[PDB]
Design an enzyme around this catalytic site. Sequence first.
Site, short mmCIF file in Angstrom:
data_model
loop_
_atom_site.label_atom_id
_atom_site.label_comp_id
_atom_site.label_asym_id
_atom_site.label_seq_id
_atom_site.Cartn_x
_atom_site.Cartn_y
_atom_site.Cartn_z
N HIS A 1 0.79 -1.25 0.00
CA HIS A 1 0.00 0.00 0.00
C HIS A 1 0.84 1.32 0.00
O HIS A 1 0.26 2.42 -0.05
CB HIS A 1 -1.06 -0.01 1.13
CG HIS A 1 -2.32 0.75 0.78
ND1 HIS A 1 -2.31 1.92 0.06
CD2 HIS A 1 -3.61 0.54 1.11
CE1 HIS A 1 -3.54 2.38 -0.07
NE2 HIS A 1 -4.35 1.54 0.54
N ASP B 1 -2.89 1.59 -4.39
CA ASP B 1 -4.11 1.93 -3.62
C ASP B 1 -5.19 0.86 -3.66
O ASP B 1 -5.08 -0.09 -4.42
CB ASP B 1 -4.68 3.34 -4.00
CG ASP B 1 -5.01 3.50 -5.50
OD1 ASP B 1 -5.20 2.51 -6.25
OD2 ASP B 1 -5.08 4.64 -5.95
#
Lengths: 234, 234, 234, 131
Positions: free
Chosen positions: C204, C208
């Site tokens: 991450h 996303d």
Amino acid sequence: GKDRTEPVKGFHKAMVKTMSAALKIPHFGYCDEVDLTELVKLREELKPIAFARGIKLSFMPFFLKAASLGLLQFPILNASVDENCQNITYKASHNIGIAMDTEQGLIVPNVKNVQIRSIFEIATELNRLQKLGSAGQLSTNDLIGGTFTLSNIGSIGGTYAKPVILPPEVAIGALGTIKALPRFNEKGEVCKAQIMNVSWSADHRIIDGATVSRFSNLWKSYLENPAFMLLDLK
Amino acid sequence: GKDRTEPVKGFHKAMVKTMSAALKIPHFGYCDEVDLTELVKLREELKPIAFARGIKLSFMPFFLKAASLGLLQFPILNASVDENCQNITYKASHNIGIAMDTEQGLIVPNVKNVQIRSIFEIATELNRLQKLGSAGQLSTNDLIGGTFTLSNIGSIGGTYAKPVILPPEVAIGALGTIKALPRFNEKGEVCKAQIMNVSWSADHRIIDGATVSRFSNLWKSYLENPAFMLLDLK
Amino acid sequence: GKDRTEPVKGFHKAMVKTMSAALKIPHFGYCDEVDLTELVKLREELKPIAFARGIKLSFMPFFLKAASLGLLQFPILNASVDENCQNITYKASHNIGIAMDTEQGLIVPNVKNVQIRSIFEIATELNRLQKLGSAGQLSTNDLIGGTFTLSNIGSIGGTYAKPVILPPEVAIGALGTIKALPRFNEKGEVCKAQIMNVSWSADHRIIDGATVSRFSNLWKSYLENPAFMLLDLK
Amino acid sequence: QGLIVPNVKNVQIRSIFEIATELNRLQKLGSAGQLSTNDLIGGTFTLSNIGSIGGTYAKPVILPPEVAIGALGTIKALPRFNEKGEVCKAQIMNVSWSADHRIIDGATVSRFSNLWKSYLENPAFMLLDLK
Ligand SMILES: CC(C)(COP(=O)(O)OP(=O)(O)OC[C@H]1O[C@@H](n2cnc3c(N)ncnc32)[C@H](O)[C@@H]1OP(=O)(O)O)[C@@H](O)C(=O)NCCC(=O)NCCSO
Ligand SMILES: [Cl-]
Ligand SMILES: [Cl-]
Ligand SMILES: [Cl-]
Ligand SMILES: [Cl-]
């Protein structure tokens, strides 16, 4: 109404330390559903015998005895690892942690030597630990020497979970809420099945995906088919 | 075509910084399913009123209001901790973040003071934040001060997830896709249920399993039984 | 019935190192269920053409080709990042790893250049890698160059999982056990659906939630509607 | 002692649950003859629950210097058509408003009564704007 800063103090300081130490462990997650229809029925037939002996018998003693039977086949799950995961200590005793949260947070007493205990002795010892837990009178010897943990999150709610491994343990399972769901039987008829989810975390430096999965399938076959447990008990 | 190496730059740098800081948080995952059949029906009754007032009413204003009501009972979920996790700041305002992705990455504006806003005012503010968000026009004051986050991954896809907590918050929920599934009613008949999954991550240094599970059961009772919300709103 | 300390040595050292390096990756998890009813039927019809050609054709070749197709639309998922995550390398070849546990051995051989291979060529190479895999004869070239990984935990068991990203990769998917579950069809009739769970993990810092989710929805459309793969293959 | 009309203060900032709490408090005092001055004064609008005993419709008497009063009848199950046109069990209650017609016109009382009734027939309408 207004913000308020507070110390973390007392028996709260220990969850901070324990959980911080767990950051050194690369957690692998593996989950599954287990069909407890037969165990639910089994437990209902055994409840009056346990109550006639003055013990409350939940599902936990079954889950614990099955984990012990599985841990005999996969002993690396009941092991500890040193500072930089250089040596593995295979631990002989199955001292299995019951995560409980009290009006003081996290306490993880264990049932000692589950491998040499009957489902009934485990239930007995569980009742002793719950009684002392709820009194806040669990002793040091109840709390130390854990080698594996189960967290029955489902006594409160939930399906799947990502439990955190308790150093120096290498694995932990979380059990969800047992729920009636529509499932197919052998003849392809929609039936009521009592389904429970299980979520396992394992230290992936030393425990691979296949070990947790095979362990989990074994634990699961003992609960789905409790007669499989009978074959090898003495 | 061939390998192409390329700087992470501008706004993309912030998600790198944010997610790397989250490595310091021992994440605990707790998941559940929620039966939204009654909410789906209720949103359909309310859709025409919100529309007449120029608002799109989605499920989020409901999830947010139920989260706020739950946080009144479990205020430690709406709190921050310091570097060492030596002190906790309980935060009075429910400034609930809405994770969204734009072409420049992750953007989490928040709805201020959800605890004194109605479901309709929450929908209005969400609408305002979405428009601004998509136009790259969020203010600094829209982005700062968040105390708790929800991520509606289910606006795109998914069931369960493992959301990453945004420091200095201590918890985040991911909501999956609402899907029709065969479930039993109390008569024991196979019915069409609108089921949604929820995945909570919580900072396990200060948040135990019971807290997150009781909070989740409360949030979930408000959404399964929306009448429950009406009792204490003014 | 005694503890035993044992060195981690040999090829057991490599899993310690890999999994410890993975602690630097902030893992986001995103999960889904895929309805494989049409694919189960499709594989059953191709199975006899596969046997005639001397090839065992499982589901993995389909999973692999659909992943490569999604990676073409979402090339960030087939990329690596540096030490402090300041530069992305988008990698052109789809060298997709198949996580295997042997007797050795977390071993992750990959299928080179999936983007230019037919499902049958992928099955051929999978069979080769399985043959050498089980003999402990996989070569260096089979092991290096990996860019994305899939882990078929469901060959043994499971529903959901939390797989660990293999540095310097940025994503991994785990596939659960395909199982018949009651599900509604368009008519709202309770049908037999072959359902499989997928669990994706992604870095991450640069990936996303929307990207992994849209990629997953694309992968999943290709498998739920395999006709969609026919349109664009050459 | 006969007619006694205590009131709940500032209903507009009270939840259904706090309103219930105050009603219980006022019922208890009312029946001990212990209602205070403050409980009794300041009323701005009145409801009379005749149905706690019986009745359907009524003609309530407005309490000067208020301009309106509503009387609530007995809730009972009556055969009623659903939207499909099937005969259903419906819990029906009558409401009777009296309003000072020197200043309150008929459209005002009717529109108010229709809104009141929408909120009770469709309670989720209350969910929308409560805080
Ligand atoms: C100590 C204990 C493990 C004991 O669990 P237990 O042995 O099932 O005992 P119990 O709580 O008394 O169980 C009482 C009832 O709940 C039921 N129950 C327990 N677990 C259940 C589950 N997973 N699903 C459905 N029902 C369950 C039992 O069947 C019993 O039912 P009856 O009263 O009808 O016979 C549990 O009470 C507890 O504290 N668990 C919480 C786990 C937790 O907090 N983990 C969080 C993670 S990090 O802090
Ligand atoms: Cl990890
Ligand atoms: Cl962790
Ligand atoms: Cl993380
Ligand atoms: Cl299901």
